[PDB]
Amino acid sequence: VDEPTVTMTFQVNTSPFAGKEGKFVTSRNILERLEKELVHNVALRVEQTDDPDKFRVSGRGELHLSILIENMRREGFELAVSRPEVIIKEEDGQLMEPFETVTIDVMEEHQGGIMENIGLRKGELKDMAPDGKGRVRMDFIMPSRGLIGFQTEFMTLTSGSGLLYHTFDHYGPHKGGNIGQRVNGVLIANAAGKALTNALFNLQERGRLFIGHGVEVYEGMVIGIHSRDNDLTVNALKAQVLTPPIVMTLEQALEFIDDDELVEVTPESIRIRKKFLTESDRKRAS
Amino acid sequence: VDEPTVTMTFQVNTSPFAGKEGKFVTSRNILERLEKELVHNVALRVEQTDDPDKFRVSGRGELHLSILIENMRREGFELAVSRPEVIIKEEDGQLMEPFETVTIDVMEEHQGGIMENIGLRKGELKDMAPDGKGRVRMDFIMPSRGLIGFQTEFMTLTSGSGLLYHTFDHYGPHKGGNIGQRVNGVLIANAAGKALTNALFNLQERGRLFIGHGVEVYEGMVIGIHSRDNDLTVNALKAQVLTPPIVMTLEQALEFIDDDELVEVTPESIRIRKKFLTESDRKRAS
């Protein structure tokens, strides 16, 4: 009830663009701000680590943490954050994960598709009620792990007409299932400079871009989603109508990144990057 | 009365140690803090420059500015500052500098030496009063330019027994005179690492050191005063009793540095450095 269910690391921005966009950049700025938050935010936990620049921050759910990050961005912070992961607990030798009660309200026509998606996310139907007017309310239990990314898919699957509400309920046996996972790789800049249309016009053929002409990139910055499952390290710098790029919400960024990535946040920007900025360091790490 | 008489530049710390000691490091932290100060500090002026990291800060006198810098250090700032210089004004084709009324109270035995030093600093005696008990009060007019460094010399020349008070009085014709000047060069570290006794034991023969064994240095950091007037670039890193080093007050640091130097300030430290960190860049600059 105090107790958190999701954790991430918050750390000093070490990108090549660090310091160019926010006024609060130091580890002590971050720690003091997290300590200010603990004064009054009861589900939050903050742990120091062996790195003075990095803090393990846990909260009631992902939204609790993304709200804090957004407040900090607005106050003038730069930082980088790792992917949210559910806190695993053990009880009498059983490994356990957090589960949420989920209420949805959708048009009858979307019911089948929603149930299918929820079942893939290890969800279980507990109750339902049609309104007799074309909509239906349904109550589910779902692991928090399977709620990651769900809001966006739910909006697609309901064409923006569905309502979704969820909150932590209990810890219970881990469900397994490869539910926390994107199936596409990323396009990664190989060098720093201003991105150019000619380079991006060719790259937009390999996937969807996050950037357009003239955006400043750095080596290791993620600039798009690959249509295949592997990562491509690419040159952004070399009629050519560019398709409008994907702009992700902070929450979508947090839900997209893998373990080898970070979301870099500033009062002005959300950037995704690899943890290891050069291709050779990512090769050596793999 | 609002109007300032001394100016310096305050800027983002760009040393190799930057960020390791203070929590407020960005240009916007510095600007916001200077803007906070202007709200209530009427003799202060703050101008932006062509460099977003650098601000021209003017005040009633040097002490006004060193008080502000000390408050900022204590609040958690890192910054670097240039030497104070008097603001020159022009009136009807005449170039003018600030002058102060100066009152001193000294033992009769120190009178001659003080008068001699004050005359070298373009000072003029206006009034005096012995107390009949062995002390004398004297009133002088001195350019602010000639007050730079005076407090320290006055304390030496009176063996700590003298009293000195001064405040701005008027602008008047520039006196000339090479009064703002140290006659010794500096010893400059040629490489980064922990200073070692063996290296410093030899260097303490060339001058007076600001550091002792184990102090972390960086290339371009000033580590001592040369007994001669030229700068020496030296290796700090290579019974050996070291003489206790010179520790300068912030004010003494500000009064010591030349135009090619900065005082680097943090909540923990006062360091002097060259503006150009490598010997080859200082050669090219000269």
PDB file of C-alpha atoms in Angstrom, chain A residues 19 22-26 28-29 32, chain B residues 19 22-26 28-29 32:
ATOM      1  CA  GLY A  19      23.544  20.075 -20.679  1.00  0.00           C
ATOM      2  CA  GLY A  22      17.896  21.603 -19.155  1.00  0.00           C
ATOM      3  CA  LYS A  23      19.210  23.554 -16.181  1.00  0.00           C
ATOM      4  CA  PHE A  24      19.277  20.769 -13.564  1.00  0.00           C
ATOM      5  CA  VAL A  25      21.796  18.197 -14.683  1.00  0.00           C
ATOM      6  CA  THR A  26      23.888  16.931 -11.736  1.00  0.00           C
ATOM      7  CA  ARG A  28      22.861  15.866  -6.573  1.00  0.00           C
ATOM      8  CA  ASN A  29      20.116  17.850  -8.336  1.00  0.00           C
ATOM      9  CA  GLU A  32      17.659  16.140  -3.900  1.00  0.00           C
TER      10      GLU A  32
ATOM     11  CA  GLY B  19      30.649  18.878 -12.090  1.00  0.00           C
ATOM     12  CA  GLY B  22      28.870  21.428  -6.904  1.00  0.00           C
ATOM     13  CA  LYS B  23      25.248  20.746  -7.792  1.00  0.00           C
ATOM     14  CA  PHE B  24      24.455  23.929  -9.753  1.00  0.00           C
ATOM     15  CA  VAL B  25      26.603  23.938 -12.851  1.00  0.00           C
ATOM     16  CA  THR B  26      24.629  25.139 -15.905  1.00  0.00           C
ATOM     17  CA  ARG B  28      20.833  28.853 -16.710  1.00  0.00           C
ATOM     18  CA  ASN B  29      21.461  28.031 -13.034  1.00  0.00           C
ATOM     19  CA  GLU B  32      18.701  32.607 -12.755  1.00  0.00           C
TER      20      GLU B  32
END
